[PDB]
Symmetry: C3
Subunit: 457 residues, 3 copies
C-alpha cells in the first residue's frame, strides 16, 4: 500500500497568512474593537532605505517600462534574505514599510536578557549579508492595539519600547546596531562590548564576544523553549508554522479582514499575480493624530478606533485605502492612498483634499486627540507586494510618500498639499495658502507647498 | 555527465486526465456511440451531504463576498482526504456530485470476495478521518455506457449493483457502512461482523475482525496483483498512474470531449485558475428519463443516445450545459445548467422553460423511454472544481439543485418549475398551472411550484 | 536553529534567460552596435521538420479549436528531450526555428578534436530517442554579430562553419549524422567509421567505435574542463547554470532587449501563460540581404546594423516584429511578422506590402548589400513558445512561413507576394505583376504569385 508524500499547503488561508505576523495569525483574541493586549519582548527595526531610495533610478527611461518589475525583483531579493534570517532566529515580522521592517521576539520578562543576545546575533548576521542596513533594538513592555469595523482590521504595537526602537534606528549609521537604553539595561553585558553614543543614552554594539565555553547553537536551542511557534520536528524545514495552516472558515474570515480586497482577489486566482506591481500616479493622504500620552493604549485605543471609523467611511466614498498605520511619540499615522490599481476615480486630487479636510475636522473633535495634521502629495509611486514568499505585505514607496509624511510632521495642525495637488485640483486658488518652505529630512526640492484652508474664511 | 532529475508531468493531457476516472483514461474503446461494456466490481458510494448542506452558510454576508472561495477551500480540504484514501486502497473515483463521490474497484469475478475486504477497510478508514459521512457498498455485475456526439462524450455505469449502492447509501446513518445484499452474499464473512438492517436485506458492518494470522499489508499487496493501474515501482509515490501520461494527440482528442470547454480554457492557461469558483445565479433543468428496465444497457443505451443527441442540440442554442448524468432505478437523469460562468444569456428563465418543453416533447417520443420528467429551478448555486489535485470535477451545489432534482421525481411525467422561474419568465400566466405542494426530502419551503403547461390548451 | 532548504530561483531574470543562450547570458560584452567577436567551436544543426510539417493536421476540425495547444504540447514534448540531451552533453542551444535547433560547443582550437567526439555521441543519442531527425555537424572558426538599437538586440553566428552546418544538414536523410568537410578533417578518426557522401566532401557517420580502453564517462569529465558553465558541484542537478542567476538590474536591462515585449509581459505575470500559443492569421515578410562575402562580420556587420535600424523603424509603425534572424551563404534573412497576438492592425496586407517596399528601397542602397529580396505571404500560422522549460523561444511555424522563405530565394531582387496578400490588399491591380510559377522546395501549390511592382512604372 503506497504512502504518497504530501504536497499541498497552498490553500487560500495560507496565502492570506503570509501577509500577517504570528501575533495576529495565532492571536485568537476577541472581535471587539478596540482590542488591547500587553506583553514584553524585543523589537528589531531594520532600516532598508539604502535599498528603497532607488525608486528614482527605476523611473528612468533606461528601464524601458519595466521599472516596477525590476524594482520589486531586486528589493525582494535583498529583503527576502533579511526575512529568512529574522525567521530562523525565531522572530515574528510585524510589518514592512518602504523604508523598514519591524520584527518582534515576544517573551516572558525573565527571558528578555537571553533573547536580546539572540536578537543581537541575528542583527550582526543581517549586516553580514551585505558586507547597507541600520538596526535599532529595543526591549521591554509592549502594547498591541487592534482596531477596525466588521469588515476590516488593523493592528499597531505601541509603548516606550516601540518609540525606543525608532529613536535607536534613527541614531544608527550604516552597519550599526544600536541598543535602546532599556535594552542595554536588560541585556547580558558579559556578552557584548558596546560604546557610548554622543549625547545619547542608547549604545552601539561593537562586538558580541561570549564567554569561553559558550556555544551559540546550544544556547539558541535552549531559547527555542520560549518560542511558541518555532518550526520543529517534522516541520523543522519550514520558515513559518503558518505554512502549515489548514482550512478553517472562521479563522480565514478573521484574517482576511487585514488584507486589501485586491490582494485577496490575487490570492483567489481571480487576478494576475503581477497586476499589483506598478509605478503609477497616486495621491497620498498621510494623517497624523497626536495624543497627550503615547504609550497607554487604554486612552488612545478608543480614540484611534473612533477616528478609524470616520476615516474608513470617508475613504470608501473614493475607494481610498489605508495602506499602513504607524505609532510613534504619541502620534498615530494613517498612510492613505487614492488611485491604487483598479481603484482610480476622476478628480482624484479634489476628492483627496476634500477627504483630508473631512478627516481633519472630524478627528480634531475626537476625545483625547490633541492635534491632527494631514499631508497630501501626488505623483508616481511604486506599489507592490514586498517581502519573502512566506512573509510579505503590499507597500508603497516613493518621494511623494516621504514628502506627505514629512509635511504632516513639519506642518502640524493643518492640512497641507504639494504643488501637483494644488495645480491639478479643480478648487479655487483662495481655498489655499502658500506656505513658508521648510528644510525637511529626506526631501530635496519638494516644490511650493500649500495649506488647504478650505472653502470659507 | 550530469543526471538532472525529471520534473515535468504538468502537460495538458495530464490536467485533462484529472477530470476523468481510469475507466475512461485507459479505456481505449471504440468511438461509436452508444458504446456499452460489461464487467464486475465493487462500488463505494460516499455521501458527503454533511459537508455540502453548508452552501447556505457561505451565502451569508459574514463571508464578505468570498463565500464561494471559502466553500471550495473547505470542501476540497475534506474531500481531498477521502480521495487520497480511495486511491491508495486501489479504487477508481468515477464521479463527484454535490452530495456524493462514487468509486469503483473493477475486478474479475473470482477476486470480488477479497476486494470487498479491501473496500470495507478503506470505508472504515474514511470514517476514521472524521472522528460525518455515510457509505454504501455494492458488488456484482456492472455495465458501462458511453454516449455522445463528435465533440462531446459522457459516461454512466448502470445495473443492479449501481442501484444497490444507492439504496445502501440511503439506508446509512452517520458513520455507517452498509453492504448491499449481494455484497454481503459475496463477501468474506469470516472477516466482518454485521447486523441486520430493519425491513432490509442489506446489512451494516459493525466490525472488521480478521483471523489471528491475518496481515492486512500482505493481503493488500496480494490484491494489487489484480489492479491494472496501481502506482508501483519507480512510480509508487504517485496517487495515480494518470499523473504520468505523456502527450498523445489522438488520446487527448478523445479525453477532452468529456470536459467542459471553460475547464479546457483554464487547463490551457487561457483563463484564470479561479474564474470557475463562484456563487452565481443559474437555472437548473433536471431531466429524468424512465425506462421499462433499468439494468440492461443494450435497450436503454440507444434510447439515451437518441435523447442526448436532441438534448445537446437544444442546449447549444442557449449555451446550456450538461453538468452530470446519473442512473438509478431505471431513471437516467441529466443535470443541465443555464448561466454557467461566461455562458450567461438574456431571458435565461424563458429559454430554460422553452428548452425543457422541447426536450420533454422529443424525449417522450423516443423508443423505450416510458416517462420524461423535468424540474426547473432558479437561484444562487455554488459552482466550482471539487476534489483532489489529481482527481476532481466541476460541480454545482445548492438548494435549487436539490429542488429541481426532487421536483422531477415527485412530479413525474410533466415539466415543473419553481416560483423564481415562474415569476421571472416573460411568458403568460395561463402557460402554467399552480401545483399541489408535496413534502419532498431535503426540501424545506421550496415555495409555490408550477407545471409548465405550454402555449396551447 | 533550523536550516530551511532554498526554493526560489524563479525570478524574472531567470525567466528571461530561458529565452537566450549562454553565449548572450554570460557574454558581458560591449553595448556598442554592431558588436563582433570571434571564436572556434562545434555546431550541431538538428532538423526537426519531421515534427513541424504536422501543423497542417492540427488545423483540422478534428482538433476542435485546440489545435495550437495540442501542437505546442506534442512539439515541446519531443523538442524538450532533444534539448535535455544537448544540455547534459555540454552544448549551448543558440536558436530554435520551426524546422530546426542550432547548438554550439565553444572551445579553444586545441580541444576541437575531442569535443567533436562528444558532439557525435550526443548526436547518436538524440537519434536513439526516436528509434526522425537529421543532424549536420560542423567545426571551425565562428563569428558572432550583435546588432540592435537602444531597446532591442539581436544576434547571429556567421562564417564558413555556420554555412557548413546548414549544407551538412541538407545532405542528411532521416537518422543521418553528417560531418562537414572541416569537421571530418578536425575529428578523431580513430573513433568513428564514416562513409563518403555522393558528389560531396562531407561524410556520414556510420559508427562511433572507440578504442578498447576508452571510457566515455571519464572522457566526458575531462572534456568538462573546457566547459565554462557546465553545472557542477552543488548545482550538478541543474540543466543550466542560468537557472541560478540572481537579480541584477544592469544585466536584466541588457538581456530583456532580446525578448519580445509580449513575452516579457507573460514573464512579469501580467498576461496569461497560454495567451501566446495560437493558430492565427498573420502576414510574414521575409527579408533577405545578400552580400559579396558571407563569412566576414567586419564588412557585413555594419551593413546589417544599418539595415536593422531602418527595418525596426518601418515595422514599429505597424507593430510588426522581427521574430528571427538567420545567416547563410552570404544571405542574412529577417523573419518579420505582422499580426502577432495583441499586435493586430487593420489593412495588415496593404501595410505589409508598403513596409516591404520601403525596406526594399532603403536596404538596396545600403553599402555592401548586393541584393535585397522580400517574400510576403499571408495565412494561418502557429505561434508559440517552443522548447524546454529551461531553454525555449517564441517561434512561428506554417506553410506560409516556408512559402515566404522560398519566395525570397527563388525570386531574388524583387518583392513578391502570395495570392492571399494580393487579393486582400486595398491596392490597385497594376501595382502588381503575375509571375512565372517555379517549383520550390517544400512548397506544394503555393497559388499564383505576384511581384509587388509598386505605385509607379
Amino acid at each position: 500500500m503506497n504512502t504518497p508524500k504530501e504536497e499541498f499547503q497552498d490553500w487560500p488561508i495560507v496565502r492570506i497568512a503570509a501577509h500577517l505576523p504570528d501575533l495576529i495569525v495565532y492571536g485568537h483574541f476577541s472581535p471587539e474593537r478596540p482590542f488591547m493586549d500587553y506583553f514584553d519582548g524585543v523589537l528589531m527595526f531594520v532600516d532598508i532605505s539604502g535599498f528603497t531610495a532607488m525608486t528614482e533610478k527605476f523611473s528612468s527611461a533606461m528601464y524601458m517600462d519595466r521599472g516596477a518589475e525590476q524594482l520589486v525583483e531586486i528589493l525582494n531579493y535583498h529583503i527576502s534574505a533579511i526575512v529568512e534570517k529574522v525567521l530562523i532566529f525565531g522572530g515574528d515580522i510585524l510589518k514592512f514599510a518602504g523604508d523598514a521592517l519591524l520584527a518582534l521576539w515576544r517573551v516572558e520578562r525573565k527571558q528578555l536578557k537571553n533573547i536580546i543576545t539572540v536578537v543581537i546575533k541575528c542583527s550582526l548576521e543581517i549586516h553580514g549579508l551585505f558586507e547597507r542596513v541600520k538596526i535599532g533594538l529595543a526591549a521591554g513592555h509592549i502594547s498591541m492595539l487592534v482596531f477596525g469595523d466588521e469588515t476590516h482590521s488593523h493592528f499597531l504595537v505601541i509603548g516606550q519600547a516601540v518609540d525606543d526602537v525608532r529613536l535607536a534606528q534613527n541614531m544608527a549609521q550604516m552597519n550599526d546596531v544600536i541598543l535602546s537604553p532599556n535594552c542595554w539595561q536588560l541585556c547580558d553585558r558579559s556578552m557584548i562590548e558596546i560604546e557610548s553614543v554622543p549625547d545619547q543614552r542608547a549604545v552601539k554594539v561593537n562586538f558580541l564576544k561570549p564567554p569561553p565555553n559558550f556555544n551559540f547553537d546550544e544556547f539558541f536551542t535552549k531559547c527555542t523553549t520560549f518560542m511558541h511557534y518555532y518550526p520543529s520536528g517534522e516541520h523543522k524545514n519550514l520558515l513559518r508554522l503558518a505554512c502549515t495552516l489548514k482550512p478553517d472558515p472562521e479563522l480565514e474570515m478573521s484574517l482576511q479582514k487585514y488584507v486589501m480586497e485586491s490582494i485577496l482577489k490575487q490570492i483567489d486566482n481571480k487576478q494576475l499575480q503581477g497586476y499589483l506591481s506598478e509605478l503609477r500616479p497616486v495621491t497620498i493622504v498621510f494623517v497624523n493624530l497626536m495624543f497627550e500620552d503615547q504609550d497607554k493604549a487604554e486612552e488612545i485605543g478608543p480614540a484611534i478606533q473612533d477616528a478609524y471609523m470616520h476615516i474608513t467611511s470617508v475613504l470608501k466614498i473614493f475607494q481610498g485605502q489605508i495602506n499602513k498605520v504607524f505609532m510613534f511619540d504619541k502620534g498615530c499615522s494613517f498612510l492613505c492612498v487614492f488611485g491604487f490599481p483598479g481603484e482610480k476615480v476622476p478628480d482624484e486630487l479634489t476628492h483627496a483634499l476634500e477627504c483630508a479636510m473631512d478627516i481633519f475636522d472630524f478627528c480634531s473633535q475626537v476625545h483625547k486627540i490633541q492635534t491632527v495634521s494631514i499631508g497630501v502629495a501626488s505623483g508616481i509611486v511604486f506599489c507592490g507586494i514586498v517581502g519573502h514568499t512566506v512573509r510579505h505585505e503590499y507597500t508603497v514607496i516613493g518621494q511623494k510618500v516621504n514628502l506627505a509624511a514629512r509635511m504632516m510632521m513639519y506642518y502640524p495642525g493643518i492640512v497641507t498639499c504639494d504643488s501637483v495637488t494644488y495645480n491639478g485640483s479643480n478648487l479655487p486658488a483662495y481655498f489655499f495658502k502658500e506656505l513658508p518652505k521648510k528644510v525637511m529630512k529626506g526631501v530635496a526640492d519638494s516644490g511650493p507647498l500649500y495649506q488647504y484652508w478650505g472653502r470659507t474664511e
